[PDB]
Design a protein around this nucleic acid. Structure first.
Ligand SMILES: [Mg+2]
Ligand SMILES: [Mg+2]
Length: 739
RNA sequence: CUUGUUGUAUAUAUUCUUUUAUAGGUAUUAAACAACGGAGAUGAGGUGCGCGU
DNA sequence: TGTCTATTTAGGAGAT
DNA sequence: CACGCGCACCTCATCTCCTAAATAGACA
């Protein structure tokens, strides 16, 4: 495993934005040449031209004249079946002798080998590899249906070849024992694979021809790889350069050779590589060859690489804790009843209910659902409904929000004056996360409004919707992005999100070390993605309230009998400009409707703002150097399932086939689970059982493999959700919801 | 070189910002806890805005 | 006439 | 379900790459 360390240069360095810019321009010229000649030239022409121009017996010319590559397009040099260095050398020398990139030197007279050959050309080739190695016709990895449509069979044969990187029948023979010597082989699938082999034998040449045609037709007009105009980074791979420590200092020195002589760049020190540690030696002994020069905030940074010894522990399963992430009442609800035993732990829902100011404002049924959380180990009391009372002045939670904030900010000073640093940081970041999300909402809504205003004022007039050039030219020439107004908002938003990310990382570090210090050897999360987040419904927009919905200039007494629009007219969300006699003209958002839309956007924006899906990544990153490891479980299963009987609720479909139900149906009103427990406490106790029970563990997760970097100890299985269901019925852990 | 990046001060001043207002900008003051594999490219998705349907 | 720096070339992926 | 064409923003996924020896050229 290789890690990177970034240093900051001290003083003046010859590397500036001019050198980086010419590096980027060279990259773009070489990439343009490759893009133009990607499907036009043969490797044979290149190899022959170098053979007849220079004259040598090297291997990178022989490999281009070997009847395996002569009558092949240049894009085959970027595949994985071609030697990764012969292709580099052949392409480099064909480009160099013809001087196609337009190389005229570089500003600092950096060695051409370190700047052109293993500089921008190496990046060009590496980038074109990823494109062409990931260039394939996306076909479903499904069952071939045995003797299905001949078109289906032929596509199945060809796709599975590149799916498993096959070449010929020699690849099929290794596949035979692969499914014959496996537990529970799918005999029906094995017959399909037998048919796949049978049809492969007769029409193998047809497969090659179709594969060759499709790949070229997928690069008919690619446009090439382009280095963006904001990159501000150059990469040089130098074999012989020296990094030394500064004398009686914590800094370093980088003696790279500029213009046939060795320069000296002085670097600041890193606590990451602090003196006398076991990682400063790992750095100074095993550092790599690539040097990255990057400019961030008009300051130059140098990035190195070194070999690191991974030491991630193995799973233990002696102690386990679940953890559900749901952006409803508390962010992190875990699966341990709070009994005042976790050392260093602070419970904020127990703290808040001990003060009469907060409890008095709560109704009878709110105290009953706050006491539920005050007994469960929970983190980050992010109250979305209370938080929106900072943006909405005429709200009903405006008084609860102030008391909640006052108590939390008082705890923040109490913890600081008692010198409890970890808890103080946790609470301080909780407060700041709550404060920063409203700022992000404010700025994003202002960006939306200032885009609307700009586009209404400009009044871009374009023809019928057919194409890009067919549309107005002013759009590309004067886009909202390049307007100075929007350019500043996008920096304000970047800074706000930058604070949000750090506060979230601090909270997650608090949780991880809390569970590590006490003795827990696994933290179980679920593989959450953006689909789980239940978006609130935004009111239909005015521009499409009457145009799409066919309610444009329609009778006031009866516009239509659509029930949803009926509901929206029941309240005063919408205003309608009536005509002379019972029609519509225009609609304007009323105050209640506008604030309802804002409330719908405020809850929705936090799926992307607060990294709902990527919370698991922080725990996985912390697990690399920590004692406690992390297990991931399949999503869309734990929340609904009952943690008392350990079974899945389901509803009988019209056909009578059992259908797994949805979270909303298995949840009572008041957002409580029909089991009687909290909705998040229930899911946490489910995530735990899928890791505590050996029988369940093999169903949902994947087998323990050797430790890696940023890889969970237990990962979600690749088996399909339906396949999970059938195993979940083998163990009979299944129930019928209401029949 | 009591050293890099980010986070953590409801800290002191403000003729500042409603386009960060329990926060930030501009200058001072306090340290101590944490985490830290980077660069580039390609692709997918969501969201906003205009034009029309 | 050593001595440092820059250039050329590396062949033919397999087991999992 | 909004639909299509563009101007953008962000978040997320996946891939390449992080070498080493021999040799020629540039110096005093
Ligand atoms: Mg900040
Ligand atoms: Mg700092």
């Amino acid at each position: 495993m290789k890690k990177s360390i970034k240093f900051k240069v001290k003083g003046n360095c010859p590397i500036t934005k001019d050198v980086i810019n010419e590096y980027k321009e060279y990259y773009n010229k070489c990439s343009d040449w490759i893009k133009n000649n990607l499907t036009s030239i043969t490797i044979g022409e290149m190899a022959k031209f170098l053979q007849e121009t220079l004259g040598k017996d090297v291997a990178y010319i022989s490999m281009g004249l070997s009847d395996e590559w002569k009558d092949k397009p240049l894009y085959h040099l970027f595949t994985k079946k071609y030697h990764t260095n012969n292709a580099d050398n052949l392409l480099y020398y064909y480009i160099k002798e013809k001087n196609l990139d337009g190389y005229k030197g570089n500003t600092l007279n950096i060695g051409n080998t370190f700047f052109r050959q293993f500089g921008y050309f190496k990046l060009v080739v590496s980038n074109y590899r990823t494109k062409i190695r990931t260039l394939n016709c996306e076909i479903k990895r499904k069952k071939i249906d045995a003797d299905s449509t001949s078109e289906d069979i032929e596509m199945q044969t060809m796709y599975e070849i590149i799916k498993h990187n096959l070449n010929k029948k020699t690849d099929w023979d290794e596949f035979i024992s692969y499914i014959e010597n496996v537990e529970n082989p799918n005999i029906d699938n094995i017959n399909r694979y037998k048919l796949l082999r049978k049809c492969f034998c007769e029409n193998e040449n047809m497969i090659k021809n179709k594969l060759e045609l499709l790949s070229i037709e997928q690069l008919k007009n690619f446009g090439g790889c382009i280095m963006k105009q904001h990159i501000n980074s150059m990469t040089l791979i130098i074999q012989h350069f020296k990094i030394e420590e500064k004398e009686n200092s914590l800094g370093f020195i980088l003696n790279l050779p500029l213009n046939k002589k060795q320069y000296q760049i002085e670097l600041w020190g890193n606590r990451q590589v602090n003196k006398g540690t076991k990682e400063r030696d790992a750095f100074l002994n095993t550092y790599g060859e690539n040097i990255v020069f990057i400019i961030n905030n008009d300051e130059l940074y140098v990035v190195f690489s070194y070999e690191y010894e991974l030491e991630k522990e193995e799973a233990n399963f002696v102690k386990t804790v679940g953890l559900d992430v749901n952006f409803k009442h508390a962010f992190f609800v875990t699966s341990e009843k709070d009994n005042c035993h976790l050392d260093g732990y602070i419970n904020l829902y127990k703290y808040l209910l001990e003060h009469d100011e907060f409890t008095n404002l709560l109704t009878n049924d709110e105290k009953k659902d706050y006491e539920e959380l005050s007994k469960v180990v929970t983190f980050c009391p992010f109250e979305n409904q209370l938080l929106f009372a900072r943006y909405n002045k005429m709200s009903k939670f405006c008084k609860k929000e102030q008391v909640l904030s006052k108590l939390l900010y008082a705890l923040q000073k109490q913890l600081k004056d008692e010198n409890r640093t970890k808890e103080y940081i946790y609470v301080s970041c909780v407060n700041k996360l709550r404060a920063k999300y409203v700022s992000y909402f404010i700025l994003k809504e202002k960006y939306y409004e200032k885009q609307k205003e700009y586009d209404i004022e400009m009044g871009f007039v374009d023809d019928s919707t057919e194409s890009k050039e067919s549309m107005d030219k002013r759009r590309t020439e004067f886009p909202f992005r390049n307007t100075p107004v929007a350019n500043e908002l996008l920096s304000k938003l970047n800074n706000v999100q930058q604070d949000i990310n750090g506060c979230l990382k601090n909270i997650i570090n608090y949780i991880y070390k809390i569970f590590e210090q006490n003795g827990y050897k696994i933290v179980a999360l679920e593989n959450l993605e953006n689909s789980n987040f239940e978006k609130k419904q935004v009111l239909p927009t005015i521009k499409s309230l009457l145009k799409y919905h066919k309610l444009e200039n329609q009778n006031v007494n009866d516009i239509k009998a659509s029930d949803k629009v009926k509901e929206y007219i029941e309240n005063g969300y919408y205003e309608l400009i009536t005509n002379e006699n019972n029609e519509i003209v225009d609609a304007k958002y009323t105050e209640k409707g506008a604030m309802k839309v804002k409330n719908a956007n405020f809850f929705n924006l936090m799926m992307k703002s607060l990294h709902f899906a990527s919370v698991k990544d922080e725990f996985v990153l912390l697990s690399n150097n920590g004692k406690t490891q992390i297990a991931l479980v399949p999503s869309e299963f734990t929340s609904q399932m009952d943690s008392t009987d350990h079974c899945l609720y389901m509803k009988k479909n019209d056909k009578g086939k059992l259908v797994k139900a949805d979270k909303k149906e298995v949840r009572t009103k008041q957002e409580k689970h029909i089991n009687g427990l909290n909705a998040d406490f229930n899911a946490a106790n489910n995530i735990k059982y899928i890791v505590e029970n050996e029988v369940w563990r093999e169903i949902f997760c994947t087998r323990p493999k050797k430790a890696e970097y940023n890889v969970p100890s237990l990962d979600t299985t690749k088996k399909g959700p339906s396949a999970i269901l059938h195993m979940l019925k083998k163990i009979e852990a299944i129930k019928i919801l209401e029949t």
